[PDB]
């Protein structure tokens, strides 16, 4: 049956976040974590979140049916991972297709891999290590109209990302939070151009600076507009637009720059808060239009570990602003 039409469910027969769509071969296909219900210790760094595999969606309208690929990747399968396979993206180069996915190592480390495949629906081959050189999670790996690909990545709290400032994990005992300096410049994610064969970053790992409408730094003590997580890249109109997640206030927002590495000025809200604490989304054109692509815990009943992904129309105005949605308004 036909689904994406007035914000419900795009799949209820097993629970999806963290939504990341494309447009491959003219169809949609959506890279969401499968979320499972482990019963695992509830906690800040994210125990409660025990994924074990991914499944690839497709949809070849919006609304349209869903289709699911069956398993595209199983955490046994990948011979570096020890556990907690979190919020995944895809990208396509010369008739080849790459996962990338965060999982912790088996030094309890956070770090990305990459999968291999033939097709947008998989199922994927992992690497045997993950990328050298990175770190924490939530990757996004964005195809500029250059064909130069870069993957921005991080996450704060439960993704480490605090704990890698000088390019070595700083430790288990280490910050479970951020900087923990409220009057310094927020921690920035991570960018970094891929290499020719999609398995590398071809440069050391740059920090993305993301300012206010004055040109200052946004703050560590600025939970309303700094960096936690999710990070995403489109272009509209030659406008690069950095949008992610704020965490404890749990706001989608946006910032603008004219190039890929920033710096990114805060201009607002994408997507007010959800059902459920986390908030992950993914941006995209198909057809002509933009859609928002986010998750909530609806159909779970409020559970924050059981989400569902959800979809809506998103408008850009030609001044490059974009309209903010409010989830449950309509
Ligand atoms: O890595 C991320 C985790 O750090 C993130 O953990 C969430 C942190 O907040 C938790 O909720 C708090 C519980 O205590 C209340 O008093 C606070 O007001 C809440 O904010 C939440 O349950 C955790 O999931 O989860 C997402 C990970 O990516
Ligand atoms: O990586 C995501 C993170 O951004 C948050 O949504 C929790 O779930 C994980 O899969
Ligand atoms: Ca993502
Ligand atoms: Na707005």
């Given at each position: 049956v036909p689904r994406g039409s007035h914000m419900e469910p795009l799949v209820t027969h097993i629970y999806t976040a963290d939504p990341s769509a494309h447009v491959f071969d003219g169809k949609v296909y959506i890279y969401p974590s499968h979320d499972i219900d482990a019963g695992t210790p509830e906690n800040d760094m994210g125990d409660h979140f025990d994924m074990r595999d991914y499944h690839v969606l497709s949809m070849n309208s919006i609304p349209g049916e869903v289709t699911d690929h069956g398993?595209?990747?199983?955490?046994?399968?990948?011979?570096?991972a020890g556990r907690q396979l979190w919020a995944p993206d895809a990208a396509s180069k010369d008739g080849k297709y790459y996962l990338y996915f965060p999982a912790k190592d088996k030094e309890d480390i956070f770090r990305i891999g990459v999968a291999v495949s033939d097709s947008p629906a998989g199922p994927f081959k992992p690497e045997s290590?993950?990328?050298?050189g990175s770190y924490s999670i939530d990757p996004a790996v964005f195809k500029d109209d250059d064909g130069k690909y870069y993957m921005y990545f991080g996450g704060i709290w439960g993704g480490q990302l605090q704990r890698w400032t000088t390019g070595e994990y700083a430790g288990?005992?280490?910050?479970?939070?951020?900087?923990?300096?409220?009057?310094?410049?927020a921690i920035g994610p991570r960018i970094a151009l891929m290499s020719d064969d999609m398995l590398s970053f071809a440069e050391p790992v740059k920090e993305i600076s993301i300012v206010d409408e004055q040109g200052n730094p946004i703050l560590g003590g600025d939970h309303d507009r700094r960096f936690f997580e999710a990070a995403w890249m489109h272009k509209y109109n030659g406008t690069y637009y950095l949008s992610y997640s704020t965490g404890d206030t749990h706001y989608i927002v946006y910032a603008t720059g004219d190039n890929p590495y920033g710096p990114f000025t805060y201009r607002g809200v994408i997507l007010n808060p959800v059902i459920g604490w986390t908030n992950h989304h993914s941006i995209v054109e198909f057809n002509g239009k933009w859609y928002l692509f986010y998750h909530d815990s609806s159909l779970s009943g409020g559970?924050?570990?059981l989400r569902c992904i959800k979809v809506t129309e998103l408008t850009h105005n030609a001044d490059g602003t974009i309209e903010t949605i409010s989830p449950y308004i309509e």
């Open positions: 398993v595209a990747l199983d955490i046994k399968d990948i011979p570096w290590e993950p990328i050298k288990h005992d280490a910050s479970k939070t951020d900087l923990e300096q409220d009057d310094a410049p559970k924050t570990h």
